[PDB]
Amino acid sequence: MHALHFSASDKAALYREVLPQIESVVADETDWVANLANTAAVLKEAFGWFWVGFYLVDTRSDELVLAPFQGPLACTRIPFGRGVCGQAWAKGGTVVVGDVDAHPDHIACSSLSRSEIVVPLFSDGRCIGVLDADSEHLAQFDETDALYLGELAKILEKRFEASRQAV
């Protein structure tokens, strides 16, 4: 059975400890939802963010649809271009928000969130979904999170491709 150690006190060092563990945990499963669910579990345990999880693109509706996550209840559907999530999708790149109250068109599924980061995932150069993380603290996410969650996105993208191949 897999088990996770994370000892490191500095943010960047904790990512360097956590990412290889995630890689190992998801290497062992083809099911995409299972892998997203365990990913978000590892992130929540390691970093303690208020909310962390995924939305996946629905090509039929041009909406992000809620997938696995840790934290309180969330909105199920985010239109293309709306919110930090829909902005990330539209831009094709990561969005870091130091103060959600000061950010344009943030969607507040929780009144409690104050900062956020959204990292898009791609297959064949099309966005398939986003990783979203939220904090109750202002400015919880910075370039360290963008770098390492971007690397995690790459690891997950490969698992998405494995999930398609496994059908």
Ligand X SMILES: C[S@@](=O)CC[C@H](N)C(=O)O
- CB 32, CB 163: distance < 8 Å: yes
CA–CA separation, 41 and 157 (whole Å): 18
Residue 7 or 125: the one with the smaller Cβ distance to a copy of itself is 7
Sign of CA dihedral 160, 157, 92, 54: positive
Read off the amino acid at residue 102. Answer: A
Could you say whether residue 116 binds ligand X (CB under 6 A)?
A: yes
Query: Which entry of Mg ion, ligand X, a copy of itself, none binds 163, CB below 5 to 8 A by partner kind?
Result: Mg ion
- CB 163, CB 31: distance < 8 Å: yes
Encoded tokens for 116:
């956020």
Could you say whether residue 35 binds ligand X (CB under 6 A)?
A: no
Could you say whether residue 90 binds a copy of itself (CB under 8 A)?
A: no
Site for Mg ion in 3-32 (CB under 5 A): 25-26, 29, 32
Could you say whether residue 134 binds ligand X (CB under 6 A)?
A: yes
Query: Which has the closest alpha carbon to 47: 150, 117, 135?
Result: 135
Looking at 32, 38, 83, 131, which residue binds ligand X (CB under 6 A)?
Answer: 83
Name the strand (E) or helix (H) holding 73.
Answer: none
Looking at 8, 37, 90, 153, which residue binds a copy of itself (CB under 8 A)?
Answer: 37
Residues that bind a copy of itself (CB under 8 A): 1-4, 25, 28-29, 31, 33-35, 37-38, 41-42, 44-45, 53, 58, 65-77, 108-109, 111
